[PDB]
Amino acid sequence: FKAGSAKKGATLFKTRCLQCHTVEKGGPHKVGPNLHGIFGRHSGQAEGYSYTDANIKKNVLWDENNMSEYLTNPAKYIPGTKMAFGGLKKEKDRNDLITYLKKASE
């Protein structure tokens, strides 16, 4: 992370985040939780919001570095996302699948 443009970041939040998040202290939850005080806190802990199983599966102390990686692809931390288009968690499942597919497709 390198410090960038807070003005451009504001426009980004408004057009990319605001539809599911508020950020001001005491702001309401929406589809996603209010993000006030998120950087001095652990993930999956906003008062008054109950998260998916994502927050018992991974747990970070938010900072610029780990949030930058999060925001690369937040959808993959939402359970169900990977399975929706055929994603397979277990490497053995993927081996098994491919072994069959190589035969079934020839």
**Does residue 48 touch a copy of itself according to CB under 8 A?**
no
Q: Which of 11, 52, 59, 68 forms a contact with ligand HEC (CB under 6 A)?
A: 52
Place of tokens 């497709």: 105
Question: For residues 32 and 17, what is the distance between their CA atoms, to the nearest angstrom?
Answer: 9
Residue 92 CB neighbours (<10 A): 9
Please, are residues 57 and 44 in contact by the beta-carbon 8 Å criterion?
no
Q: Is 61 near a copy of itself (CB under 8 A)?
A: no
Q: Is 21 annotated as a binding residue?
A: yes
Asked if 95 is part of the footprint of a copy of itself (rule: CB under 8 A), the reply reads yes
DSSP letters of 48-87? T----THHHH---B--HHHHHHHTT-GGGGSTTHHHHTT-
- Tell me if 53 contacts a copy of itself by CB under 8 A: no
Alpha-carbon distance 15 to 35, whole Å? 16
Should residue 34 be labelled a site residue for ligand ZE7 when binding is judged by CB under 6 A? no
Interface residue list for ligand HEC (CB under 6 A) = 16-17, 19-21, 31-33, 35, 38, 43-46, 51-52, 54, 67, 71, 74, 78, 85-86, 88, 97, 101
Interface residue list for ligand ZE7 (CB under 6 A) = 43-44, 51, 54-55, 58, 60, 66, 69-70, 77
Q: Which residues are annotated as a binding site for heme c?
A: 17, 20-21, 83
